[PDB]
Design a protein around this ligand. Structure first.
Ligand SMILES: COC[C@H]1C[NH2+][C@H](C)CN1CC(=O)N1CC(C)(C)c2cnc(Cc3ccccc3)cc21
Ligand SMILES: [Zn+2]
Length: 107
């Protein structure tokens, strides 16, 4: 799978700019919004809806309409420094508590 980057230095600096990430998508048919994705640090791999974060290297796929780019970034890549910079730890905790409390009402 490859370990997530938790340093303050991006794993993919060529994708550090919003505009660079935006080009990777092209025509995007998926339920998830490409500008929203690029904003959350993601660029497209060109394989279905597979994206990676420029900073942590974290990969995500199979975007349901109910799944938010930032929330998913926090769910699966909580050590991402870009995520911490943009959203703050207070936002990150809420998302974590929300997901971890979803583990309650399902089970
Ligand atoms: C499949 O789980 C549920 C889905 C549902 N839709 C959400 C938007 C996201 N969510 C997590 C996810 O997609 N994960 C979690 C985990 C970290 C375990 C992981 C590992 N590898 C891949 C595949 C991949 C490899 C390389 C680049 C991109 C994608 C996807 C993936
Ligand atoms: Zn990240």
């Amino acid at each position: 799978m490859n370990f997530p980057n938790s340093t303050n230095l991006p794993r993919n600096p060529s994708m550090a700019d919003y505009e660079a990430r935006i080009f990777t998508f092209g025509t995007w048919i998926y339920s998830v919004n490409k500008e929203q994705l690029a904003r959350a640090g993601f660029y497209a791999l060109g394989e279905g809806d597979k994206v990676k974060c420029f900073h942590c290297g974290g990969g995500l796929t199979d975007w349901k309409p109910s799944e938010d780019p930032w929330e998913q970034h926090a769910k699966w890549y909580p050590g991402c420094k870009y995520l911490l910079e943009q959203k703050g730890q207070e936002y990150i905790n809420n998302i974590h508590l929300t997901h971890s409390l979803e583990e309650c009402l399902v089970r």
